[PDB]
């Protein structure tokens, strides 16, 4: 019975930059992102997801980090 209840309860992802500084960024969301996945930001900028914490993902920014700012969508 417990298994069926657990299944009943259990029954394109986009993240957001919460912090950004000097060539590194932290991203919220993206539960299904792979480590060292090549993320992309709105400004036509890429990033490498080095650290995956329990609440946010650390991404080193490749290229012009100037174009990144808090509240940007990352995919």
């Amino acid at each position: 019975x417990x298994x069926x209840x657990x299944x009943x309860x259990x029954x394109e992802e986009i993240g957001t930059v919460i912090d950004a500084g000097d060539g590194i960024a932290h991203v919220e969301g993206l539960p299904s992102v792979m480590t060292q996945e090549l993320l992309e930001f709105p400004g036509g900028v890429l990033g490498v997801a080095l650290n995956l914490d329990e609440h946010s993902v650390g991404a080193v920014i490749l290229g012009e980090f100037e174009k990144i700012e808090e509240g940007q969508q990352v995919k």
């Binding site: 019975x1 417990x2 209840x5 657990x6 009943x8 309860x9």
Partner: protein, 45 residues
């Protein structure tokens, strides 16, 4: 009795951790799965 169940069932206990998830669905699931009306009322409270 509910405490005995929640301790004996580790997976159900982990699922019962809901402060990060939407509390409404957690309450619905707990009520559906879980009697003394007042004890279950306190449990949902």
């Amino acid at each position: 009795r509910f405490g005995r169940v929640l301790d004996a069932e580790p997976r159900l206990s982990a699922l019962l951790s809901d402060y990060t998830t939407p509390a409404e669905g957690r309450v619905a699931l707990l009520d559906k799965a879980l009697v003394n009306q007042t004890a279950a009322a306190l449990l949902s409270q």
